[PDB]
Design an enzyme around this catalytic site. Sequence first.
Site, short mmCIF file in Angstrom:
data_model
loop_
_atom_site.label_atom_id
_atom_site.label_comp_id
_atom_site.label_asym_id
_atom_site.label_seq_id
_atom_site.Cartn_x
_atom_site.Cartn_y
_atom_site.Cartn_z
CE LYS A 64 -2.17 6.99 -3.65
NZ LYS A 64 -2.57 5.98 -2.56
CG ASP A 66 -9.45 4.27 2.59
OD1 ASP A 66 -8.88 4.52 3.69
OD2 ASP A 66 -8.80 3.87 1.61
CD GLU A 108 -5.27 3.43 -2.24
OE1 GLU A 108 -6.16 4.07 -1.68
OE2 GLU A 108 -4.18 3.97 -2.59
CG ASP A 118 -1.54 1.23 1.62
OD1 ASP A 118 -1.77 2.02 0.69
OD2 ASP A 118 -1.88 1.45 2.83
#
Length: 382
Positions: free
Chosen positions: A69, A197, A173, A8
């Site tokens: 990211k 999430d 994810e 991850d």
Amino acid sequence: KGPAVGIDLGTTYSCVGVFQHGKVEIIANDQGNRTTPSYVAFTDTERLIGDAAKNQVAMNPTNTVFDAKRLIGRRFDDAVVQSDMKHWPFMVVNDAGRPKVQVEYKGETKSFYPEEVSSMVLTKMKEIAEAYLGKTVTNAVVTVPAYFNDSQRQATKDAGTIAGLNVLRIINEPTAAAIAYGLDKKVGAERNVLIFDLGGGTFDVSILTIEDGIFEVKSTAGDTHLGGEDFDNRMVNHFIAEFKRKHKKDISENKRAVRRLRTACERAKRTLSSSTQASIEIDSLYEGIDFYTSITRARFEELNADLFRGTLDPVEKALRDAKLDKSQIHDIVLVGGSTRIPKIQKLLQDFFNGKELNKSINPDEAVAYGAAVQAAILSGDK
Ligand SMILES: Nc1ncnc2c1ncn2[C@@H]1O[C@H](COP(=O)(O)OP(=O)(O)O)[C@@H](O)[C@H]1O
Ligand SMILES: [Mg+2]
Ligand SMILES: [Mg+2]
């Protein structure tokens, strides 16, 4: 070969797992940590990554990089890159249409593409698994947001190859997260899963429909700027104000103090998911003065209440866009560090009228865990 790992690669924290002996081992780093911060620091001697890099951030604001990211697979003129640039303390520059992070390193000026920063985070992650495995790690399943486009995917894949990883698959994810719970292995008649999430910096809600082990993203909702950092910030403000009344001063303009305060707040937040009260202790915070205080869970929940209640809006939105009703969701999976907050678990559960949450796997590890699993399937060892 070796065993293949799941990684991850997260906006603020990353995690590596390995499937062995029938079980996923979420691997702890050198400091004992099961998740590692997506930080890269440059000093005048060395290059730091993870816990090391974050541990010195208040000291070296302008040369510690994070949030890479939010730059990955994007162009410098991208309106997202442009607004984001205004909050990072590190310098971001244009290289022929491509964003680069600019830092000072050993006295020299240097620059890096997102995929290079992300490649360094994937290096630290590779080395974690290797130190645990006593083996070279070569193969990896790496995860990405479901909203990620072919270019964002491709640059992450390159983040891998540059870290010296062979990326067996780039997987979403929320699919990883469903896999870690075995939701891809139920009974025929198709199922609806909501992934909730809430991470450090981003909030994603995903509705996934599962037909005979095939996974389809029905809808995704969320907020690219809602996460734990934001709850930490409501705390910094509480505490900046608290120092005013107690100690008759204003720390607001001291970078270092506010950062150090940020760090104590983040740590006290984690404690409030388990306890109703947490202590803050900072030797020599602003001009010699020590700060000792506490924060109750009720007051934490009070400073954040709109932010927490509001997380239910993207849930209704995603249900609307998936043409689904509340009562049509079969599993709700918690992904993300912030989902450990009992209030958020209360909001989410209440909304779903008492439905149980899938919460037995640490939410900040469920992505890496399902990825570890899928990695062992793609190597044959499963
Ligand atoms: N025990 C906890 N209670 C509340 N927040 C937590 C807890 N543990 C971690 N967090 C918060 O989780 C966020 C990290 O999310 P995680 O999924 O690990 O990273 P990411 O969003 O980058 O994938 C941070 O803001 C962190 O402080
Ligand atoms: Mg994440
Ligand atoms: Mg263990």
